[PDB]
Design a protein around this ligand. Structure first.
Ligand SMILES: CC(=O)N[C@@H]1[C@@H](O)[C@H](O)[C@@H](CO)O[C@@H]1O
Ligand SMILES: [Cl-]
Ligand SMILES: [Cl-]
Ligand SMILES: [Cl-]
Ligand SMILES: [Cl-]
Ligand code: NA
Length: 129
Protein backbone atom coordinates (compact mmCIF):
# COMPACT_ATOMS: atom_id res chain seq x y z
CA UNK A 1 0.00 0.00 0.00
CA UNK A 2 1.20 3.48 -0.92
CA UNK A 3 -0.17 5.90 1.68
CA UNK A 4 -1.24 9.43 1.10
CA UNK A 5 0.64 11.97 3.20
CA UNK A 6 -2.35 12.93 5.37
CA UNK A 7 -3.60 9.32 5.46
CA UNK A 8 -0.27 8.20 6.92
CA UNK A 9 -0.18 11.11 9.39
CA UNK A 10 -3.59 10.06 10.72
CA UNK A 11 -2.54 6.41 11.07
CA UNK A 12 0.69 7.33 12.86
CA UNK A 13 -1.21 9.62 15.25
CA UNK A 14 -3.78 6.92 16.01
CA UNK A 15 -0.96 4.52 16.92
CA UNK A 16 0.57 7.07 19.32
CA UNK A 17 3.61 8.16 17.31
CA UNK A 18 2.82 11.87 17.59
CA UNK A 19 5.44 13.39 19.94
CA UNK A 20 6.64 9.88 20.88
CA UNK A 21 10.01 10.38 22.63
CA UNK A 22 9.64 14.08 21.83
CA UNK A 23 9.43 13.66 18.02
CA UNK A 24 6.46 15.57 16.60
CA UNK A 25 4.29 13.89 13.96
CA UNK A 26 5.91 15.79 11.09
CA UNK A 27 9.22 14.09 11.89
CA UNK A 28 7.73 10.62 11.38
CA UNK A 29 5.88 11.58 8.19
CA UNK A 30 9.03 13.17 6.77
CA UNK A 31 11.11 10.10 7.66
CA UNK A 32 8.63 7.73 5.96
CA UNK A 33 8.49 9.98 2.90
CA UNK A 34 12.23 9.75 2.39
CA UNK A 35 12.78 6.19 3.64
CA UNK A 36 10.01 4.56 1.55
CA UNK A 37 8.10 7.25 -0.39
CA UNK A 38 5.10 6.17 1.76
CA UNK A 39 5.16 2.61 0.31
CA UNK A 40 4.58 -0.09 2.92
CA UNK A 41 6.07 -2.68 0.52
CA UNK A 42 9.46 -0.93 0.11
CA UNK A 43 12.57 -3.08 0.55
CA UNK A 44 16.25 -2.21 0.12
CA UNK A 45 19.34 -4.40 0.46
CA UNK A 46 22.26 -3.10 2.53
CA UNK A 47 25.91 -3.67 1.66
CA UNK A 48 26.43 -6.02 4.63
CA UNK A 49 23.66 -8.34 3.38
CA UNK A 50 20.90 -7.05 5.65
CA UNK A 51 17.67 -5.55 4.30
CA UNK A 52 15.45 -2.61 5.31
CA UNK A 53 11.70 -3.23 5.28
CA UNK A 54 8.52 -1.22 5.03
CA UNK A 55 7.35 2.33 5.40
CA UNK A 56 10.11 3.23 7.91
CA UNK A 57 12.77 0.97 6.34
CA UNK A 58 13.56 -1.01 9.49
CA UNK A 59 16.80 -3.01 9.27
CA UNK A 60 17.04 -6.80 9.68
CA UNK A 61 20.53 -6.36 11.18
CA UNK A 62 18.96 -5.58 14.58
CA UNK A 63 15.20 -5.36 14.55
CA UNK A 64 13.45 -8.14 12.62
CA UNK A 65 14.06 -11.67 11.35
CA UNK A 66 14.18 -12.47 7.63
CA UNK A 67 16.11 -15.76 7.74
CA UNK A 68 18.91 -14.40 5.55
CA UNK A 69 20.97 -12.04 7.76
CA UNK A 70 23.26 -14.43 9.65
CA UNK A 71 24.56 -13.08 12.94
CA UNK A 72 21.75 -10.52 13.29
CA UNK A 73 19.24 -9.77 16.04
CA UNK A 74 15.43 -9.68 16.08
CA UNK A 75 14.90 -7.11 18.84
CA UNK A 76 11.30 -6.34 17.81
CA UNK A 77 10.54 -10.11 17.78
CA UNK A 78 8.79 -10.00 14.40
CA UNK A 79 9.31 -11.46 10.95
CA UNK A 80 10.44 -8.69 8.65
CA UNK A 81 7.48 -9.44 6.35
CA UNK A 82 5.20 -8.08 9.11
CA UNK A 83 6.78 -4.68 8.37
CA UNK A 84 5.42 -4.82 4.80
CA UNK A 85 1.74 -5.10 5.71
CA UNK A 86 -0.77 -2.46 4.66
CA UNK A 87 -1.46 -2.15 8.41
CA UNK A 88 1.41 -0.16 9.94
CA UNK A 89 0.87 -1.39 13.51
CA UNK A 90 4.00 -3.56 13.46
CA UNK A 91 6.18 -0.84 11.93
CA UNK A 92 4.99 1.69 14.51
CA UNK A 93 5.53 -0.59 17.50
CA UNK A 94 9.02 -1.45 16.28
CA UNK A 95 9.83 2.21 15.57
CA UNK A 96 8.86 3.01 19.17
CA UNK A 97 11.47 0.52 20.36
CA UNK A 98 14.16 1.82 17.98
CA UNK A 99 13.69 5.49 18.87
CA UNK A 100 13.89 4.60 22.58
CA UNK A 101 17.31 2.93 22.36
CA UNK A 102 19.34 6.10 23.04
CA UNK A 103 20.00 7.60 19.61
CA UNK A 104 16.51 8.92 18.90
CA UNK A 105 15.57 9.29 15.26
CA UNK A 106 19.22 9.33 14.16
CA UNK A 107 18.72 5.59 13.57
CA UNK A 108 16.92 6.60 10.33
CA UNK A 109 19.58 7.75 7.84
CA UNK A 110 17.02 9.53 5.66
CA UNK A 111 15.60 11.44 8.64
CA UNK A 112 19.09 12.49 9.70
CA UNK A 113 20.08 13.65 6.22
CA UNK A 114 16.77 15.03 4.92
CA UNK A 115 14.42 15.87 7.83
CA UNK A 116 16.52 16.76 10.86
CA UNK A 117 16.79 20.53 11.09
CA UNK A 118 14.14 21.29 8.46
CA UNK A 119 10.55 22.55 8.74
CA UNK A 120 9.10 19.10 9.35
CA UNK A 121 5.69 20.55 10.26
CA UNK A 122 5.23 21.19 6.53
CA UNK A 123 4.65 17.44 6.16
CA UNK A 124 1.39 17.52 8.17
CA UNK A 125 0.23 20.95 6.97
CA UNK A 126 -3.35 20.85 5.71
CA UNK A 127 -4.20 17.48 7.28
CA UNK A 128 -7.18 17.31 9.63
CA UNK A 129 -5.91 14.91 12.32
C1 LIG B 1 16.08 2.28 12.04
C2 LIG B 1 16.58 1.59 10.80
O1 LIG B 1 16.41 0.38 10.65
N1 LIG B 1 17.19 2.40 9.89
C3 LIG B 1 17.74 1.96 8.62
C4 LIG B 1 19.28 1.86 8.66
O2 LIG B 1 19.59 0.84 9.56
C5 LIG B 1 19.94 1.64 7.28
O3 LIG B 1 21.32 1.89 7.36
C6 LIG B 1 19.30 2.48 6.18
C7 LIG B 1 19.73 2.08 4.78
O4 LIG B 1 19.32 3.07 3.86
O5 LIG B 1 17.87 2.58 6.24
C8 LIG B 1 17.26 2.86 7.46
O6 LIG B 1 17.50 4.19 7.86
CL1 LIG C 1 5.29 18.38 13.29
CL1 LIG D 1 18.63 -14.32 9.84
CL1 LIG E 1 -2.73 1.45 9.31
CL1 LIG F 1 16.11 12.24 21.28
NA1 NA G 1 17.58 -10.10 12.01
Amino acid sequence: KVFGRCELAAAMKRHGLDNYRGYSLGNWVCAAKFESNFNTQATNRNTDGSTDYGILQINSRWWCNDGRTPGSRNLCNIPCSALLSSDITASVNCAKKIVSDGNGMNAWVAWRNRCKGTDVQAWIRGCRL
